[PDB]
Design a protein around this ligand. Structure first.
Ligand SMILES: Cn1cnc2c(O)nc(N)nc21
Ligand SMILES: Cn1cnc2c(O)nc(N)nc21
Lengths: 270, 263
């Protein structure tokens, strides 16, 4: 299983670590951080210029372009690492692709007007992440009859949506969207059954690093969540997740080596 | 529904337990380290008074008793935690039980003269660990050993309800063997006995990552989670606080799963 973009490829025969580069002096520091993450073993860098947190304010397209495009450009010309961009905006998708981004990572799954068409035009890999509602209100009262079933149904529908727009399955990744319109028990129900999403025969991406599903479980703040985040990462990767999106790259890469050694000796866990 | 009974209390093995390592190979400092591990969430303390490491200095019966017994006694008097004692000597087994030890943890699986009888006399739970570097099928060999040792114990009057199995990570095993056993750990549940594992800071992490003993936390946590996801009941570690947090995540995950186990 592989992905192709910008004349290179990403081999997903072992779990990859995606380091988070939050860009909400600035350019200089961003590239410094990307370098540290690459040295720590990150093979994808995730650049995001609009907050995806509960209650977040929107960001204008001109400001998002200013935050994201020169960061993506600078990385793509200095390093060989793959680059993903967290954007919902057609114009950021186009301009990011133009300067070398490899993966379109939209928490809104190209729901914005023109996003679907801009994504397809790029020819790039696209991640489809489940979210209930939208970031302004998604965490007010998350509710599911059957969260696994509804997330699974969403993937079926969105895959169809992308295919019809000319984005082939071979370009798609799936992400259950931990924390996005989900309470604590919803998150663990999905993590417990993550392996069952392999039926789509698509790459699985997960992001749990320092999130509330760890915080609310341990009752600690964001800086005390490394051990829980590693446990989540390991649980996901043992079930065959292909990309793990994290803040703490070095520690996560070490954990994935152990997972990889265990998987090699096996005849995936489920 | 798996439980262990000892010294008038019981250990509920419906969820994983973290066992903290207390090295005593003074009494004040041993008690304070035990207090820190309990505060960090360890529910068993493993006390060792002749090191189990390779080529560690052997000690006399009297020395091991002087090292081990006062520590077991002090913990049993001050805390509600369960106590595991690392020993191979009949006399230490006997005296440890007398001052409140809950589990006999013998890396040699009660192989020394007298040890099997002394263990059976105490009525305490007994951990059977595998130790031998080469195997035709390391899992099959470890599985045969367990079959052998379980029988030997049952013959001596130690019922199956008292046994725990440990595959013995790093004990006569190379990198490949260790990960082979880790990968297939869930298959050992066919014995219907508790599984105890210890991978904390060991060579199966160190050689894989090429880092020193103090740099292996992330890898140790990965091993723990992997074992616990497969239904391992007790995890023996140096870093209790972090392991306990990781086990809490594993338990939230298993509670959401139908099988309550990954294989
Ligand atoms: C941008 N972003 C924040 N959290 C995320 C998650 O969990 N997945 C993806 N794909 N993107 C995320
Ligand atoms: C005492 N000791 C050291 N390592 C050990 C391991 O891996 N298992 C058990 N049961 N005891 C151990």
């Amino acid at each position: 299983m592989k992905l192709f973009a910008q004349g290179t490829s990403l081999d997903l025969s072992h779990p990859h670590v995606m380091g988070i580069l939050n860009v909400t002096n600035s350019l200089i520091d961003a590239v410094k951080h990307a370098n540290l993450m690459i040295n720590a073993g990150a093979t994808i860098i995730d650049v995001g210029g609009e907050s995806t947190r509960p209650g977040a304010a929107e960001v204008s397209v001109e400001e998002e372009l200013q935050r994201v495009i020169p960061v993506v450009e600078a990385i793509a010309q200095r390093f060989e690492v793959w680059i993903s961009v967290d954007t919902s905006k057609p114009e950021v998708i186009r301009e990011s692709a133009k300067v070398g981004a490899h993966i379109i990572n939209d928490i809104r799954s190209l729901s914005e007007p023109g996003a679907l068409e801009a994504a397809a035009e790029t020819g790039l890999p696209v991640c489809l992440m489940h979210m209930q509602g939208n970031p302004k209100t998604m965490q007010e009262a998350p509710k599911y009859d059957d969260v696994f079933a509804e997330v699974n149904r969403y993937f079926i529908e969105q895959i169809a949506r992308c295919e019809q727009a000319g984005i082939a399955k071979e370009k798609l990744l799936l992400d259950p969207g931990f924390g996005f319109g989900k309470n604590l028990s919803h998150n663990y129900s999905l993590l417990a059954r993550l392996a069952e999403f392999h039926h789509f025969n698509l790459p699985l991406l997960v992001g749990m690093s320092r999130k509330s599903m760890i915080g609310q479980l341990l009752n600690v703040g964001p800086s005390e969540r490394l051990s829980g985040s590693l446990a989540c990462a390991v649980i996901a990767a043992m079930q065959g997740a292909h990309i793990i999106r994290v803040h703490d790259v070095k520690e996560t890469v070490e954990a994935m080596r152990v997972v990889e050694a265990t998987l090699s000796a096996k005849e995936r866990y489920e």
